[PDB]
Amino acid sequence: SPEEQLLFLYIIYTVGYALSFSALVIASAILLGFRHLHCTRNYIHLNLFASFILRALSVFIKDAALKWLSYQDSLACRLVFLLMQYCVAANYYWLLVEGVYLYTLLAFNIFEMLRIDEGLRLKIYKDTEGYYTIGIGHLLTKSPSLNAAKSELDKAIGRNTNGVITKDEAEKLFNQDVDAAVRGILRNAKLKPVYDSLDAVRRAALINMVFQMGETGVAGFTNSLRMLQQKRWDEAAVNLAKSRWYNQTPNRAKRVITTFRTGTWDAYSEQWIFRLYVSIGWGVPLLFVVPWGIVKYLYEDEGCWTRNSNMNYWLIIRLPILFACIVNFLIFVRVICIVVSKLKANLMCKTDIAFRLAKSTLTLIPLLCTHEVIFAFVMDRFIKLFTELSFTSFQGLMVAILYCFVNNEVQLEFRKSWERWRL
Ligand SMILES: CC1(C)CC([C@@H](Nc2ccc(-n3cnc(C(F)(F)F)c3)nc2)c2ccc(C(=O)NCCC(=O)O)cc2)C1
């Protein structure tokens, strides 16, 4: 039947958005309620969820307005459609920042953490404690003799130093120190079990302290290292503040304790970038959705602007989206070589967060952007393409599923608090 087909697809679409909405609100509720989940990654997700929830709201509003001059002629419809188009470009751009965040998350490592903490020197300097340092955090000897420090550096660099050392030579010695730091952990009976129980990020947190103090020194934190292995992050955090290390160099300590406490790079994460992401996810939409809304109100106003087929004015919401998809696929491309390397190199297990996120993210990029890309310059078997409307509807649900319900972290939060109820 013709009428029966058109009605059944409508059912699946609305229950798609009903289930989507419900699930995404529950998920955002979870990310917001549990304190441990308060990190930049999940904040980006909450923005993404918002874009999907708001899209859902538009769907439900349009539907309620069917209930009693017609609705297609009204201006309130054209407004709800502009809100929905904004959400759609917000979906695709919070996905672009979801892609960018993932890329940089793969690009930040210990080498970028220690370049931030330790600084860079070109010439040899006599530090406060008495050690001559140069390069990135490379202490030479405490022996109070600049002549002998320059020589001690010359054997450690090969050619004659003179005092000034080039950027490439410093990066070479920096690599040397970091290999030495990880070997020092693994050659340490108290640091290896905890290091092998830590995830890559908290691993880099441990490496950092070794780079500053040394293997035999951070081993001293017996009180803290035990509760780090027992996965009790917050109880160790307050314990590491009560340290000599925290009172000696506190700005460095706070960053590293936060990295133990959270498991993210957020304490090495400039506060202005999260801005520029909330700006690109929500802002740049506003940079091509509203001038569309104008040419559509001015030059193409016909039945809530659905009869969108005349002239260039279709392109200017499809090209910016098209452009995001292109990159999101370039990103999609580059990322995978990244992950193949990092898993081949054993640099990145499958238990880690950068990988878990590429699982999610790299799924959604094509599942969202692929259709966009195929029919790249098409403007417009009929019961077949109807099924695209079932995918989009459930899109919202899928995100929640992928970005909260199957996410390991939140499941640990649930079990942890039921246990707090029993005890
Ligand atoms: C509808 C589906 C069947 C498709 C979806 C599926 N997508 C997906 C799965 C795997 C790869 N993949 C593997 N290797 C590479 C490579 F090449 F190395 F990069 C990529 N790519 C894409 C998926 C399944 C499982 C998860 C998952 O457990 N999430 C929890 C992780 C977390 O959030 O904490 C996520 C996504 C689910």
Numbering used by the authors: 136 to 203, 218 to 257, 1001 to 1160, 261 to 372, 380 to 422
Publication passage describing the model:
GLP-1R belongs to the class B family of G-protein-coupled receptors (GPCRs), a group characterized by a 120–160 residue folded extracellular domain (ECD) followed by a canonical transmembrane domain (TMD). One class B GPCR, the glucagon-like peptide-1 receptor (GLP-1R), has been considered as an anti-diabetes drug target and there are several peptidic drugs available for the treatment of this overwhelming disease. The widely accepted two-domain binding model suggests the ECDs of class B receptors recognize the C-terminal helices of their hormone peptide ligands, thus facilitating binding of the N-terminal region of the peptides to the TMDs for downstream signaling. Wild-type TMD of GLP-1R (residue range 128–431) is extremely unstable as suggested by size-exclusion chromatography (SEC) and thermal-shift assay. We have previously described that ten thermal-stabilizing mutations were introduced in the TMD structure of GLP-1R in complex with two negative allosteric modulators (NAMs), PF-06372222 and NNC0640, and we showed that a di­sulfide bond (I3175.47bC—G3616.50bC) and a GCGR mimicking mutation C3476.36bF are indispensable for crystallization.
To study the effects of these sites we made further constructs in which we mutated back single point (C2333.36bM, named M9 hereafter), double points (C1932.63bS/C2333.36bM, named M8 hereafter) and quadruple points (C1932.63bS/C2333.36bM/A2714.47bS/F1962.66bI, named M6 hereafter). These mutants covered the sites where the engineered mutations seemed unnecessary since a di­sulfide bond was not formed (C1932.63bS/C2333.36bM), as well as the sites that affect either intramolecular interactions (F1962.66bI) or intermolecular interactions during crystal packing (A2714.47bS). Notably, the M6 crystals were apparently worse than the others and the collected M6 data were cut to 3.1 Å using the same criteria (CC1/2 > 0.6). The cell contents of M9 and M8 are within 2% variation compared with M10, whereas the differences between M6 and the other three are larger. For example, the b axis of M6 (71.1 Å) is 4.7 Å longer than that of M10 (66.4 Å), while the c axis of M6 is 2.4 Å shorter. Compared with M8, M6 shared a similar thermal stability but much worse crystal diffraction, which must be a consequence of the two back mutations in M6, F1962.66bI and A2714.47bS. Reflecting on the positions of these two residues, we reasoned that the mutations F1962.66bI and A2714.47bS affected intrinsic thermal stability and extrinsic crystal packing, respectively. Phe1962.66b was located in the extracellular half of TM2, and the bulky phenyl group formed stronger hydrophobic interactions with nearby residues Tyr220ECL1, Ala2253.28b, Val2293.32b, Ala1992.69b and Ala2002.70b [Fig. 2(e)], thus the back mutation of F1962.66bI weakened the inter-helical interactions and thermal stability of the TM2–ECL1–TM3 region.
